[PDB]
Design an enzyme around this catalytic site. Structure first.
Site, PDB file in Angstrom:
ATOM      1  N   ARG A   1       2.252   2.133  -1.942  1.00 55.31           N
ATOM      2  CA  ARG A   1       2.837   0.680  -1.515  1.00 55.31           C
ATOM      3  C   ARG A   1       2.203  -0.455  -2.418  1.00 55.31           C
ATOM      4  O   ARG A   1       1.107  -0.709  -2.088  1.00 55.31           O
ATOM      5  CB  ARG A   1       2.801   0.448  -0.001  1.00 55.31           C
ATOM      6  CG  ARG A   1       3.645  -0.523   0.432  1.00 55.31           C
ATOM      7  CD  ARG A   1       3.590  -0.664   1.869  1.00 55.31           C
ATOM      8  NE  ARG A   1       4.845  -1.447   2.465  1.00 55.31           N
ATOM      9  CZ  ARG A   1       4.638  -2.582   3.150  1.00 55.31           C
ATOM     10  NH1 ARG A   1       3.407  -3.049   3.675  1.00 55.31           N
ATOM     11  NH2 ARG A   1       5.833  -3.300   3.513  1.00 55.31           N
TER      12      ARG A   1
ATOM     13  N   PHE B   1       0.620  -9.598  -2.626  1.00 56.53           N
ATOM     14  CA  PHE B   1       0.259  -9.627  -1.239  1.00 56.53           C
ATOM     15  C   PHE B   1      -0.728  -8.473  -1.632  1.00 56.53           C
ATOM     16  O   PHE B   1      -1.936  -8.833  -1.079  1.00 56.53           O
ATOM     17  CB  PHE B   1       1.559  -8.999  -0.606  1.00 56.53           C
ATOM     18  CG  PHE B   1       1.180  -8.622   0.965  1.00 56.53           C
ATOM     19  CD1 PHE B   1      -0.016  -8.990   1.501  1.00 56.53           C
ATOM     20  CD2 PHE B   1       2.340  -7.776   1.413  1.00 56.53           C
ATOM     21  CE1 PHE B   1      -0.131  -8.681   2.745  1.00 56.53           C
ATOM     22  CE2 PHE B   1       2.075  -7.553   2.881  1.00 56.53           C
ATOM     23  CZ  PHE B   1       0.877  -7.759   3.401  1.00 56.53           C
TER      24      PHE B   1
ATOM     25  N   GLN C   1      -1.456  -0.776  -1.378  1.00 56.24           N
ATOM     26  CA  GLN C   1      -1.959  -0.052  -0.254  1.00 56.24           C
ATOM     27  C   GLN C   1      -2.165   1.499  -0.739  1.00 56.24           C
ATOM     28  O   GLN C   1      -1.087   1.903  -1.685  1.00 56.24           O
ATOM     29  CB  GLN C   1      -0.968  -0.122   0.799  1.00 56.24           C
ATOM     30  CG  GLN C   1      -1.421   0.735   1.886  1.00 56.24           C
ATOM     31  CD  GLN C   1      -0.756   0.557   3.174  1.00 56.24           C
ATOM     32  OE1 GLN C   1       0.147  -0.368   3.043  1.00 56.24           O
ATOM     33  NE2 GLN C   1      -0.603   1.610   4.190  1.00 56.24           N
TER      34      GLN C   1
ATOM     35  N   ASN D   1      -4.050   0.160   9.486  1.00 54.01           N
ATOM     36  CA  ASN D   1      -4.028   1.109  10.655  1.00 54.01           C
ATOM     37  C   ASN D   1      -2.788   0.851  11.410  1.00 54.01           C
ATOM     38  O   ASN D   1      -1.903   0.651  10.888  1.00 54.01           O
ATOM     39  CB  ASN D   1      -5.108   0.254  11.826  1.00 54.01           C
ATOM     40  CG  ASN D   1      -4.892  -1.171  11.968  1.00 54.01           C
ATOM     41  OD1 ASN D   1      -3.873  -1.542  12.469  1.00 54.01           O
ATOM     42  ND2 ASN D   1      -5.739  -2.077  11.921  1.00 54.01           N
TER      43      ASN D   1
ATOM     44  N   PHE E   1      -6.084  -1.309   2.225  1.00 56.51           N
ATOM     45  CA  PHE E   1      -5.393  -1.984   0.971  1.00 56.51           C
ATOM     46  C   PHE E   1      -6.447  -2.950   0.205  1.00 56.51           C
ATOM     47  O   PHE E   1      -7.537  -3.034   0.710  1.00 56.51           O
ATOM     48  CB  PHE E   1      -4.203  -2.721   1.492  1.00 56.51           C
ATOM     49  CG  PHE E   1      -4.939  -3.679   2.745  1.00 56.51           C
ATOM     50  CD1 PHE E   1      -4.686  -3.125   4.191  1.00 56.51           C
ATOM     51  CD2 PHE E   1      -4.785  -5.066   2.542  1.00 56.51           C
ATOM     52  CE1 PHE E   1      -4.887  -3.743   5.282  1.00 56.51           C
ATOM     53  CE2 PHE E   1      -5.121  -5.779   3.848  1.00 56.51           C
ATOM     54  CZ  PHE E   1      -5.127  -5.182   4.961  1.00 56.51           C
TER      55      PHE E   1
ATOM     56  N   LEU F   1      -4.130 -11.601   8.688  1.00 55.05           N
ATOM     57  CA  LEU F   1      -4.935 -10.323   9.174  1.00 55.05           C
ATOM     58  C   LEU F   1      -6.098 -10.183   9.929  1.00 55.05           C
ATOM     59  O   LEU F   1      -6.686  -9.491  10.180  1.00 55.05           O
ATOM     60  CB  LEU F   1      -4.858  -9.516   7.707  1.00 55.05           C
ATOM     61  CG  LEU F   1      -3.362  -8.930   7.425  1.00 55.05           C
ATOM     62  CD1 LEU F   1      -3.639  -7.996   5.997  1.00 55.05           C
ATOM     63  CD2 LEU F   1      -2.545  -8.375   8.235  1.00 55.05           C
TER      64      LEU F   1
ATOM     65  N   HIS G   1      -7.488  -6.462  11.082  1.00 58.10           N
ATOM     66  CA  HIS G   1      -7.593  -5.290  10.179  1.00 58.10           C
ATOM     67  C   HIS G   1      -9.283  -5.383   9.813  1.00 58.10           C
ATOM     68  O   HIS G   1      -9.639  -6.556   9.352  1.00 58.10           O
ATOM     69  CB  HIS G   1      -6.787  -5.413   8.884  1.00 58.10           C
ATOM     70  CG  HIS G   1      -5.572  -5.080   9.165  1.00 58.10           C
ATOM     71  ND1 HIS G   1      -4.783  -3.677   9.149  1.00 58.10           N
ATOM     72  CD2 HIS G   1      -4.431  -5.893   9.694  1.00 58.10           C
ATOM     73  CE1 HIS G   1      -3.578  -3.735   9.439  1.00 58.10           C
ATOM     74  NE2 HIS G   1      -3.307  -4.985   9.975  1.00 58.10           N
TER      75      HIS G   1
END
Length: 164
Positions: A54, A59, A62, A101, A112, A121, A125
């Site tokens: 991904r 952004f 991942q 997660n 990521f 986040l 995370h």
């Protein structure tokens, strides 16, 4: 004293370049050690040969699902999932390494690489590392992503291990 690991990145089998990461073992030792062991493969399984499934430009990138290759698998050296260790470190900008997660205390092997400061986040995370060399290579990976995260070519970790 903080370990440094590397990813040699390949795009559809063609070598792209190398990224190295500093792991903040001083602040998140249990989480860092997970990423380190999975990078060397010393427990008999880990990231070598796995893909980035991904990539969303602007952004993050991942990866880390080495058992189902699509965001549904992976596992830690501690078992199938381990706890949120702490949230001392924040998502301050591009280059930050953070754990994916599925809710509280569900860390496995997916992570990521942030390509922008992701402050929403924070506290959700666990941040455990940062790109040390090869941020330009992460930027090149970005160009293979898309808005919905699908990659136009296959981005794989051709080799990985510990440098320091």
């Amino acid at each position: 004293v903080n370990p440094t690991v590397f990813f040699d990145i390949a795009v559809d089998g063609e070598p792209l370049g190398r990224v190295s990461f500093e792991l903040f073992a001083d602040k998140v030792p249990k989480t860092a050690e997970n990423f380190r062991a999975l990078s060397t493969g010393e427990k008999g399984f880990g990231y070598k040969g796995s893909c980035f499934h991904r990539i969303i430009p602007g952004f993050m990138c991942q990866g880390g699902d080495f058992t189902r290759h699509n965001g549904t698998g992976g596992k830690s050296i501690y078992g199938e999932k381990f706890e949120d260790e702490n949230f001392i470190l924040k998502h301050t900008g591009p280059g930050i390494l953070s754990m994916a997660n599925a809710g509280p205390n569900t860390n496995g092997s997916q992570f990521f690489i942030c390509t922008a400061k992701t402050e929403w986040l924070d506290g959700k995370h666990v941040v455990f590392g940062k790109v040390k060399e090869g941020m330009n290579i992460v930027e090149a990976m970005e160009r293979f992503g898309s808005r919905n995260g699908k990659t136009s070519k296959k981005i794989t970790i051709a080799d990985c291990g510990q440098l320091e």
